[PDB]
C-alpha cells in the first residue's frame, strides 16, 4: 500500500514546464529512501522539510509537480524567484514547504534534431499566481488592434519549443523537475512514513 | 507604424542622478518586453536593463544597485533611473523593443549621457574665408562642451557638397568641429553663406557669416 | 547516514588569509545544507551562514554578512570558510553543521576546527614541580609559558590515571599559557614510588618528563 | 533576528531527578501551513560537538532515549529531562530555524546536584628550580568540593594581591561530581624575596569559616 | 559571461559583390543569434533573427546561417546604402552579448585629394589663438598622410585630424587637419604650408600661406 512515487519520478515521458502535470497523493503509506539515498539527482533543495524526517511524519496531502525545464531555469524552482518560467509557467509561494528535485535528462529529452516537444510560455501580461496552471493557446496581443487568432504584428504565438539538442552545453540541456508539496490541513491525515 | 522617440540625455556629474524616457507608439508597453541597451562613444553595444510584460525587471551586473527600469503606461512611456552614475557610463543610450529577452526588432534613436565634473560652455564660430573652377570655405566651431553641435549652411538650403567633421577633443577638455562646403569660384560675392551653428547643452545659436 | 569531516587546527598571526574546509561522505549530501557555527571560548553557538553545495546559494548572518566568505566544491562534496585578514577576535572552534534543507534542524555536524589567531609565536613550555608537603597528600607539576595551547600531561606515563586533574589552560597576559596537573596519592608512598609527570608539547616538539619528590 | 533567551543560566539536580529549562522567544517561530513550531534542542558535552536532541519542539532525533522529551508552543518552549543519568552533564542549547539568520539561545549548563563537600586545601612554595629563573609561582588546590562556587583570596605578609592570579576550574568529575579548583600566584623572584608569609585564604559552603593554608619563605 | 568575437574587424567590397562575416562565440548558444546593422547617426536595425529567418522589410540579399559557435552573415547584390557596421548577438544564456562590430566600405576608384588651406580669422587672432585649417575633399581611399611645415620645419603635438563617413554621393571621404597655436607662436613664423601624401597622387601636394 505504497504511495505510487515510481509513477512520477521514473515516468517514460514528461510534460512541459507550461503544462506541468500534477499528481495527488493520498490514503498511502510512503516511503522516501528511494528519493534522499538516490545520487541521480543534480539538484534536491528542500524548503521548510527534512526528507530524512520524511519517513516519520504525516500529511493530509502531497502533490508531485512534472516538467521539464532548462539548466539555467532549474534556480527559477524555488519561492520569491523571478524569471520566465517562476512568472509565466510555474511559480512557487514565498512561503512553500516542500523540495525540488531535478536531474539530467539530456539522454531522454534531447534528439538529434530539435526536439521541440517541451513547450513553455513567452508573453504573459501578468505573472502567476503561485501552483497556477495557464495552458491558454490564444494570441498574444501586444498592440490595441484584436489578432483574431492569426499571428503576425503586434501578435504573437505565447508558446515557445526548446530546442533541446545534444550538442549544447549543460545549462541548455533538459532537465526534468519534480516538485514536492507537502500539505497539511485541518483535516484527517492520509499520507504517512512507515 | 513603430515610433521610439528618447529623452533626457545630457551633461551630468559623477554621482549626480539622471532619468531617460522612452515614449512608445505602435504597440501596447505593458504588454511588451522593453530593454535599454548603451555604446559607449567608439565602442561596442552593451545590454543594461530589461523589463518584462509582466513587470519583472532585471539589470546587468555594471548597473545593479543604480540603475532602475520603469514604465508608465498612462504614458507610454519606458523610463530609466540612474542615480549613482559614474564616468564609465557616458554612453549612447539606446531605447529597444525586446522581443521575449531575445532579440530587439525595433530601436529608438538613442540620447546621449555624458558624465563628467567638467561645465558646460558655448562654442565659438569662427569663419574659414575662401581662398584666392571650384572655391572651399567654412567655419570653426571650437572649445564647446559637451556635444551634440548641429552645423547648418544658409538655414538648410545648402546641402550638396557640404561635410561636417565628427568632432575632435582637445588638449583642454574641450571639443572642436570643422564644417566646409565646396562652392564654385563664381557666385562668390553674389551669394551669402552664412553657417548656423547650434549648440543645444550651452543654448547657444551663432549664424556666422563667411566672406573674403 | 552522513558524515561531516573537517579540517584540522590553524595557528595563525593576524593578518593571515585563512581558509578551513568541512567534507562530507555517506548516502545523501544533495539535501543537506551545509551552515557555520562559531563557538568563541567560553561563549555559546553563533550561527554565521549557510550554503548549498549543489548550487553554491549562501545565506549569511547579519554580523558576519562582509567579514567571511562561505563558498563550497560539489565536485567534491566539501564546503569552506575563508578569512581574508584575521583577527584575534576570530579565535574561536568553528563547526560545520548539516541539514537536509533551508529552515531545518541540523543533525549531522562536523567534528570543529580550532582557530588560534594570535601574535605570540611557538614556545616550548617549562615544567616545574609541585613537590608535596606537610593519610591524603597531594603533589603536582607546573606546564608555564607555551603557544599553542595543545599540550598533554601523563602522570607515570599514563600508568597513574586515578585522582588526576589538569586543570584547564589559563591564557596569561603575556600572550601565553599556563596549565598545572596535579595527582592524589597516599601519604605513605611518598618515599616507596616516584612520581613522573610527562608533559608533551607537539607543536614545539618539546618532551618534559619531571621527577617529583618532597623536599 | 529571532531572539531566544532560555533560563535557568545554570542547574543543579541529583541522579534520577527531573531537569527542566524554559526556552522564551521574541517571535513566534510557528509554520501555520503545516502546524509544526521551527524550534530544536542541542546537546553539548565538554570538549565535543552539539549534537540534535529534538527538533519541531516535540519530536526527538534517532537514537535519544526516551528521557528527552520536548515541549511548547508559540513563544514559550521547554525541555524536560525525565530522570538524569550521568551521561547527560552537558550544556543544552534552544535554536529555531523558523527564518533566517538562525539564532541559538544564551545556554544552559546542567550538573549533576550531590552533597555539600568541603575542599580540601592545598598550597604549594614554589620550586627552588623555577626561582633560579627569577618567578616565583605559588598554587593553591581546592581539590574536591562542591558547589562550584568558591572565594580565594592571596594575602601575602596579611596584604590583599590584585592582578598576579589566575584561576582554573576542572569539570565535574563523572564519578562523585566533585570540582577542583587551582589558584597561581605569579611574581617575580624579586618581589617573592620581600615577603615572607604566603596565605591562601578560601571561602566555601561547605567551610564554617574560611580555611587559610601559608607557609614562609 | 560570453563573448562574441566578430571576424573581420572591417572589410572593403565593391557593390555587387557578396560579404560575408564571422560571428564566433565562447559557448554554445543553438541558432539563439541575432544580426544588427547600424548606419553612421542612426540607430541598430534588427537584420536576422533566430540566426537563420529574416526580419521583416529586409531584402532577400541577407542571409544568416551557423548552427552554435560559428555564425555567417552573408549579403549579396551590395548596394551602396547597404553598408554599415554590423553587430551579432546572442540570446543563449544571461546576460545577453554583442560582438565589436565588424564595418563594410563601398569601395570605388581611387580619388586625388583636393587640397585646401585656411588662415586663422583675425576674430580668433583677437582672442589670442591661431587655428591653421588643412582640408582634404573628396578622396579615396581613406588612407592619407598630411604634415604640418612651418617655415619648412616639420611640426608635431598641435594636430589632430578628423575623417568623415563615406559620402552616399561619390563615396568620397574628407579629412580635416588643424593646427593649434597661440598668437605669439603663431607671430613667430612667416610661412605655414600643408603637405599631403596620398595613392592618388603622383607626388606630395603643398598648400601654404604667408601670415
Ligand atoms: C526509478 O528507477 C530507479 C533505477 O533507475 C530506482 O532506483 C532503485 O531503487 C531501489 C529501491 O529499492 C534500489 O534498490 C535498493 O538499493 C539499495 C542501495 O541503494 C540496497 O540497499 C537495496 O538492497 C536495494 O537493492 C536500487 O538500487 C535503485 N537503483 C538505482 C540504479 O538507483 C528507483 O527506485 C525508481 N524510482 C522510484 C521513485 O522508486
Not at chain 3, 582557530?115 to 603533589?139: E, I, N, Y
Amino acid at each position: 500500500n505504497l504511495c505510487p512515487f515510481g509513477e512520477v519520478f521514473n515516468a517514460t515521458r514528461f510534460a512541459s514546464v507550461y503544462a506541468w502535470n500534477r499528481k495527488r497523493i493520498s490514503n498511502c503509506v510512503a516511503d522516501y529512501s528511494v528519493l534522499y539515498n538516490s545520487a541521480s539527482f543534480s539538484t534536491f533543495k528542500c524548503y521548510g522539510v527534512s526528507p530524512t524526517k520524511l519517513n516519520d511524519l504525516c500529511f493530509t496531502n502531497v502533490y508531485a509537480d512534472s516538467f521539464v525545464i532548462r539548466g539555467d531555469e532549474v534556480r527559477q524552482i524555488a519561492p520569491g524567484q523571478t524569471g520566465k518560467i517562476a512568472d509565466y509557467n510555474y511559480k512557487l509561494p514565498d512561503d512553500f514547504t516542500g523540495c525540488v528535485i531535478a536531474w539530467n535528462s539530456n539522454n531522454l529529452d534531447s534528439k538529434v534534431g530539435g526536439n521541440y516537444n517541451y513547450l513553455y510560455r513567452l508573453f504573459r501580461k501578468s505573472n502567476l499566481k503561485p501552483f497556477e496552471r495557464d495552458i491558454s493557446t490564444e494570441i498574444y496581443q501586444a498592440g490595441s488592434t484584436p489578432c483574431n487568432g492569426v499571428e503576425g504584428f503586434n501578435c504573437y504565438f505565447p508558446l515557445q519549443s526548446y530546442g533541446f539538442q545534444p550538442t549544447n552545453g549543460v545549462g541548455y540541456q533538459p532537465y526534468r523537475v519534480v516538485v514536492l508539496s507537502f500539505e497539511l490541513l485541518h483535516a484527517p491525515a492520509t499520507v504517512c512514513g512507515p | 507604424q513603430v515610433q521610439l522617440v528618447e529623452s533626457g540625455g545630457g551633461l551630468i556629474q559623477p554621482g549626480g542622478s539622471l532619468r531617460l524616457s522612452c515614449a512608445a507608439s505602435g504597440f501596447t508597453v505593458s504588454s511588451n518586453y522593453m530593454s535599454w541597451v548603451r555604446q559607449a562613444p567608439g565602442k561596442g553595444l552593451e545590454w543594461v536593463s530589461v523589463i518584462y510584460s509582466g513587470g519583472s525587471t532585471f539589470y546587468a551586473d555594471s548597473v545593479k544597485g543604480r540603475f532602475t527600469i520603469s514604465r508608465d503606461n498612462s504614458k507610454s512611456t519606458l523610463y530609466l533611473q540612474m542615480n549613482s552614475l559614474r564616468v564609465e557610463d557616458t554612453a549612447v543610450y539606446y531605447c529597444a523593443r525586446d522581443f521575449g529577452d531575445f532579440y530587439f526588432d525595433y530601436w529608438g534613436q538613442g540620447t546621449l549621457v555624458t558624465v563628467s565634473s567638467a561645465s558646460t560652455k558655448g562654442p565659438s564660430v569662427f569663419p574659414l574665408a575662401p581662398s584666392s573652377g571650384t572655391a572651399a570655405l567654412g567655419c570653426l566651431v571650437k572649445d564647446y562642451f559637451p556635444e551634440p553641435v548641429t552645423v547648418s549652411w544658409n538655414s538648410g538650403a545648402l546641402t550638396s557638397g557640404v561635410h561636417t567633421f565628427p568632432a575632435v577633443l582637445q588638449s583642454s577638455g574641450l571639443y572642436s568641429l570643422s564644417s566646409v562646403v565646396t562652392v564654385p569660384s563664381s557666385s562668390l560675392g553674389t551669394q551669402t553663406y552664412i553657417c548656423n551653428v547650434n549648440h543645444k547643452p550651452s543654448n547657444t545659436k551663432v549664424d556666422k557669416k563667411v566672406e573674403p | 547516514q552522513m558524515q561531516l569531516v573537517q579540517s584540522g587546527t590553524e595557528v595563525k598571526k593576524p593578518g593571515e588569509s585563512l581558509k578551513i574546509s568541512c567534507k562530507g561522505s555517506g548516502y545523501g549530501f544533495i539535501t543537506y545544507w551545509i551552515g557555520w557555527v562559531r563557538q568563541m571560548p567560553g561563549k555559546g553557538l553563533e550561527w554565521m551562514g549557510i550554503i548549498y553545495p549543489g548550487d553554491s546559494e549562501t545565506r549569511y548572518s547579519p554580523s558576519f554578512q562582509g567579514q567571511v566568505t562561505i563558498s563550497a566544491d560539489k565536485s567534491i562534496n566539501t564546503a569552506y570558510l575563508q578569512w581574508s585578514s584575521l583577527k584575534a577576535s576570530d579565535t574561536a572552534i568553528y563547526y560545520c553543521a548539516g541539514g537536509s534543507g533551508i529552515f531545518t534542524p541540523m543533525d549531522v555536524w562536523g567534528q570543529g576546527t580550532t582557530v588560534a589567531v594570535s601574535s605570540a609565536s611557538t614556545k616550548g613550555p617549562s615544567v616545574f614541580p609541585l613537590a608535596p608537603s606537610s593519610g591524603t597528600a597531594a603533589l603536582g607539576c607546573l606546564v608555564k609559558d607555551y603557544f599553542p595551547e595543545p599540550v598533554t600531561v601523563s602522570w607515570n606515563s599514563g600508568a597513574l590515571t586515578s585522582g588526576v586533574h589538569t586543570f584547564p589552560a589559563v591564557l596569561q597576559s603575556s600572550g601565553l599559557y599556563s596549565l598545572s596537573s596535579v595527582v592524589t596519592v597516599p601519604s605513605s608512598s611518598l618515599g616507596t614510588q616516584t612520581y613522573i609527570c610527562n608533559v608533551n608539547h607537539k607543536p614545539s616538539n618539546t618532551k618534559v618528563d619531571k621527577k617529583v619528590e618532597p623536599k | 533576528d529571532i531572539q531566544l533567551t532560555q533560563s535557568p543560566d545554570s542547574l543543579a539536580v541529583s541522579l534520577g531527578e527531573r531537569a527542566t529549562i524554559n526556552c522564551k522567544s521574541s517571535q513566534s517561530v510557528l509554520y501555520s501551513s503545516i502546524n509544526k513550531n521551527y524550534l530544536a534542542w542541542y546537546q553539548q558535552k565538554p570538549g565535543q560537538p552539539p549534537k540534535l536532541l529534538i527538533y519541531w519542539t516535540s519530536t526527538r532525533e534517532s537514537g535519544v532515549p526516551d528521557r528527552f522529551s520536548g515541549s511548547g508552543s508559540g513563544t514559550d518552549f521547554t525541555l524536560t529531562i525525565s530522570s538524569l543519568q550521568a551521561e547527560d552533564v552537558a550544556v543544552y542549547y534552544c535554536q529555531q530555524y523558523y527564518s533566517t539568520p538562525y539564532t541559538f539561545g544564551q545556554g544552559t549548563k546542567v550538573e549533576i546536584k550531590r552533597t555539600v563537600a568541603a575542599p580540601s586545601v592545598f598550597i604549594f612554595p614554589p620550586s627552588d628550580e623555577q626561582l633560579k629563573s627569577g618567578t616565583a609561582s605559588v598554587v593553591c588546590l581546592l581539590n574536591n568540593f562542591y558547589p562550584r562556587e568558591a572565594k580565594v583570596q592571596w594575602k601575602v605578609d596579611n596584604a590583599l594581591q590584585s592582578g598576579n592570579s589566575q584561576e582554573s576550574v576542572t569539570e565535574q568529575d563523572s564519578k562523585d561530581s566533585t570540582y577542583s579548583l587551582s589558584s597561581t600566584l605569579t611574581l617575580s623572584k624579586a618581589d617573592y624575596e620581600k615577603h615572607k608569609v604566603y596565605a591562601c585564604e578560601v571561602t566555601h559552603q561547605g567551610l564554617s569559616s574560611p580555611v587559610t593554608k601559608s607557609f614562609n619563605r
